Design an enzyme around this catalytic site. Structure first.
Site, PDB file in Angstrom:
ATOM      1  N   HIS A  68       0.850  -1.214   0.000  1.00 48.39           N
ATOM      2  CA  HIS A  68       0.000   0.000   0.000  1.00 48.39           C
ATOM      3  C   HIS A  68       0.879   1.256   0.000  1.00 48.39           C
ATOM      4  O   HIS A  68       0.753   2.107   0.885  1.00 48.39           O
ATOM      5  CB  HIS A  68      -0.994  -0.054   1.162  1.00 48.39           C
ATOM      6  CG  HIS A  68      -2.118  -1.011   0.963  1.00 48.39           C
ATOM      7  ND1 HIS A  68      -2.146  -2.235   1.579  1.00 48.39           N
ATOM      8  CD2 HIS A  68      -3.254  -0.925   0.224  1.00 48.39           C
ATOM      9  CE1 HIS A  68      -3.260  -2.869   1.244  1.00 48.39           C
ATOM     10  NE2 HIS A  68      -3.964  -2.084   0.417  1.00 48.39           N
ATOM     11  N   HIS A  72       1.657   1.517  -5.724  1.00 48.18           N
ATOM     12  CA  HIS A  72       0.218   1.136  -5.772  1.00 48.18           C
ATOM     13  C   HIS A  72      -0.629   2.335  -6.227  1.00 48.18           C
ATOM     14  O   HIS A  72      -1.519   2.152  -7.052  1.00 48.18           O
ATOM     15  CB  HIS A  72      -0.231   0.576  -4.424  1.00 48.18           C
ATOM     16  CG  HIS A  72      -1.685   0.268  -4.355  1.00 48.18           C
ATOM     17  ND1 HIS A  72      -2.250  -0.788  -5.040  1.00 48.18           N
ATOM     18  CD2 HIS A  72      -2.693   0.863  -3.689  1.00 48.18           C
ATOM     19  CE1 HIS A  72      -3.542  -0.836  -4.779  1.00 48.18           C
ATOM     20  NE2 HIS A  72      -3.838   0.164  -3.964  1.00 48.18           N
ATOM     21  N   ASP A 217      -8.312  -0.600  -8.166  1.00 46.65           N
ATOM     22  CA  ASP A 217      -7.647  -0.982  -6.904  1.00 46.65           C
ATOM     23  C   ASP A 217      -7.182  -2.431  -6.983  1.00 46.65           C
ATOM     24  O   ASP A 217      -6.193  -2.730  -6.325  1.00 46.65           O
ATOM     25  CB  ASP A 217      -8.584  -0.801  -5.707  1.00 46.65           C
ATOM     26  CG  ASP A 217      -7.864  -0.659  -4.387  1.00 46.65           C
ATOM     27  OD1 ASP A 217      -6.654  -0.334  -4.402  1.00 46.65           O
ATOM     28  OD2 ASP A 217      -8.519  -0.862  -3.358  1.00 46.65           O
ATOM     29  N   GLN A 269      -6.025 -17.571  -3.573  1.00 45.03           N
ATOM     30  CA  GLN A 269      -6.141 -16.758  -4.820  1.00 45.03           C
ATOM     31  C   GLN A 269      -7.383 -17.201  -5.607  1.00 45.03           C
ATOM     32  O   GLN A 269      -8.141 -16.283  -6.053  1.00 45.03           O
ATOM     33  CB  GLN A 269      -4.852 -16.819  -5.651  1.00 45.03           C
ATOM     34  CG  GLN A 269      -3.659 -16.098  -5.008  1.00 45.03           C
ATOM     35  CD  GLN A 269      -3.978 -14.637  -4.810  1.00 45.03           C
ATOM     36  OE1 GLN A 269      -4.239 -13.903  -5.766  1.00 45.03           O
ATOM     37  NE2 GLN A 269      -4.029 -14.218  -3.553  1.00 45.03           N
TER      38      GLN A 269
HETATM   39  C1  LIG Z   1      -4.493 -10.394  -5.369  1.00 45.82           C
HETATM   40  C2  LIG Z   1      -5.227  -9.609  -4.340  1.00 45.82           C
HETATM   41  N1  LIG Z   1      -5.591  -8.270  -4.530  1.00 45.82           N
HETATM   42  C3  LIG Z   1      -6.282  -7.535  -3.568  1.00 45.82           C
HETATM   43  C4  LIG Z   1      -6.634  -8.183  -2.311  1.00 45.82           C
HETATM   44  C5  LIG Z   1      -7.384  -7.448  -1.228  1.00 45.82           C
HETATM   45  N2  LIG Z   1      -6.252  -9.577  -2.128  1.00 45.82           N
HETATM   46  N3  LIG Z   1      -6.444 -10.411  -1.083  1.00 45.82           N
HETATM   47  C6  LIG Z   1      -5.875 -11.595  -1.332  1.00 45.82           C
HETATM   48  C7  LIG Z   1      -5.927 -12.723  -0.361  1.00 45.82           C
HETATM   49  C8  LIG Z   1      -6.897 -13.722  -0.902  1.00 45.82           C
HETATM   50  C9  LIG Z   1      -6.880 -14.923   0.052  1.00 45.82           C
HETATM   51  N4  LIG Z   1      -5.768 -15.584   0.462  1.00 45.82           N
HETATM   52  C10 LIG Z   1      -6.168 -16.550   1.334  1.00 45.82           C
HETATM   53  N5  LIG Z   1      -5.264 -17.478   1.946  1.00 45.82           N
HETATM   54  C11 LIG Z   1      -3.898 -17.502   1.505  1.00 45.82           C
HETATM   55  C12 LIG Z   1      -5.734 -18.383   2.934  1.00 45.82           C
HETATM   56  C13 LIG Z   1      -4.660 -19.292   3.473  1.00 45.82           C
HETATM   57  C14 LIG Z   1      -5.700 -19.821   2.532  1.00 45.82           C
HETATM   58  N6  LIG Z   1      -7.494 -16.505   1.460  1.00 45.82           N
HETATM   59  N7  LIG Z   1      -7.947 -15.478   0.629  1.00 45.82           N
HETATM   60  C15 LIG Z   1      -9.310 -15.009   0.416  1.00 45.82           C
HETATM   61  N8  LIG Z   1      -5.337 -11.564  -2.571  1.00 45.82           N
HETATM   62  C16 LIG Z   1      -5.575 -10.277  -3.042  1.00 45.82           C
HETATM   63 MG   LIG Z   2      -7.212   1.086   0.621  1.00 40.76          MG
HETATM   64 ZN   LIG Z   3      -5.620   0.572  -2.773  1.00 42.94          ZN
END
Ligand SMILES: Cc1ncc(C)n2nc(CCc3nc(N(C)C4CC4)nn3C)nc12
Ligand SMILES: [Mg+2]
Ligand SMILES: [Zn+2]
Length: 313
Positions: A68, A72, A217, A269
């Site tokens: 952030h 970004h 974003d 992901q």
């Molecule tokens: C690419 C991207 N851009 C913006 C944002 C806000 N995010 N947030 C994520 C996290 C996604 C995510 N990771 C997990 N893990 C690793 C858990 C252990 C299994 N759960 N989740 C939902 N990746 C992004």
């Molecule tokens: Mg923000």
């Molecule tokens: Zn942002």
């Protein structure tokens, strides 16, 4: 007055594409942003001296956190530039001015922690702003910097134009609160399907600008696979630091933020692309057809996370 910013040929051509990466040379990001304001808005939108001084105060007020950060801010503004250029006639002179500025300013003075962590730490900002905590802070920091001497880039606007642009910027920044995205996309989904969606309805425009802000974003998921993959490392570096801090308060973090669940990143992901990214770019393509390359790029990157899980990389 007769001073065009130009870019080397590879950047001049590739900056027009949704998947453009602004590169690792920090000192070119201000020039890139100005170039985008000039082509999006005109060389007459802002007094150059004030714009440059505003860009450098915004830069100074982003912190050296892994994700952030200033990179970004400029990345999210470039995605907005591509949306605005591919939908020339749908946006007012004020919206074009306000949204690029909103994107540059949308994570001002971010500390690398979620609204949740502020609330569980009992940070003073969580007492000042009960919901969208950081996002109300980000808008607040934008107004502060606009009120520094020599920094009022909107000085040539009327009293009412000025209030309209600050209100576009406020809603735009508030909408980057992902907790608000889900409801906002659900309403836009229905309005488009029943045919009730009307871009002359100011509350409808608001929702549409809100969706553009979520799209911009999240645009790390719309880049060439190596950019996407390497940005994911930065994203998890913040999340896992937050997880460590949650544990310091004596709280099991959500799996997302637990560095002990590194192994599950590929599956996380998939969840994220299916629950958040794909539906975001789908609805955006329906409403603004020329943004399809974002949906297409997102689906390609989903397929690359699927390949990671299958051990094909
Ligand atoms: C690419 C991207 N851009 C913006 C944002 C806000 N995010 N947030 C994520 C996290 C996604 C995510 N990771 C997990 N893990 C690793 C858990 C252990 C299994 N759960 N989740 C939902 N990746 C992004
Ligand atoms: Mg923000
Ligand atoms: Zn942002």
């Amino acid at each position: 007055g007769l001073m065009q910013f130009t870019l080397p040929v590879r950047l001049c051509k590739e900056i027009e594409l949704f998947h453009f990466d602004i590169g690792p040379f920090e000192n070119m990001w201000p020039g890139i942003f100005v170039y985008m304001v000039h082509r999006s808005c005109g060389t007459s939108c802002f007094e150059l001296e004030k714009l440059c001084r505003f860009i450098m105060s915004v830069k100074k007020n982003y912190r050296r956190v892994p994700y952030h950060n200033w990179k970004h801010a400029v990345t999210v503004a470039h995605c907005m530039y591509a949306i605005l250029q591919n939908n020339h006639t749908l946006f007012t002179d004020l919206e074009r001015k306000g949204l690029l500025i909103a994107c540059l300013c949308h994570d001002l003075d971010h500390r690398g922690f979620s609204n949740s962590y502020l609330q569980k730490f009992d940070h003073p900002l969580a007492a000042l702003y009960s919901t969208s905590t950081m996002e109300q802070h980000h808008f607040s920091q934008t107004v502060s910097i606009l009120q520094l001497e020599g920094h009022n880039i909107f000085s040539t606007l009327s009293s009412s134009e000025y209030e309209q642009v600050l209100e576009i910027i406020r809603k735009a920044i508030i909408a980057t609160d992902l907790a608000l995205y889900f409801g906002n996309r659900k309403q836009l989904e229905e309005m488009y399907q029943t045919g009730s969606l009307n871009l002359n309805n100011q509350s409808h425009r608001d929702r549409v600008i809100g969706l553009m802000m979520t799209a911009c974003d999240l645009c790390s998921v719309t880049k060439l696979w190596p950019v996407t993959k390497l940005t994911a490392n930065d994203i998890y570096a913040e999340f896992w630091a937050e997880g460590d801090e949650m544990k310091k308060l004596g709280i099991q973090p959500i799996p997302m933020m637990d560095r002990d669940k590194k192994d599950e990143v590929p599956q996380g992901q998939l969840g994220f692309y299916n629950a958040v990214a794909i539906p975001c770019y789908t609805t955006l393509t329906q409403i603004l057809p020329p943004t399809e390359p974002l949906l297409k790029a997102c689906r390609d990157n989903l397929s690359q996370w699927e390949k990671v899980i299958r051990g094909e990389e």
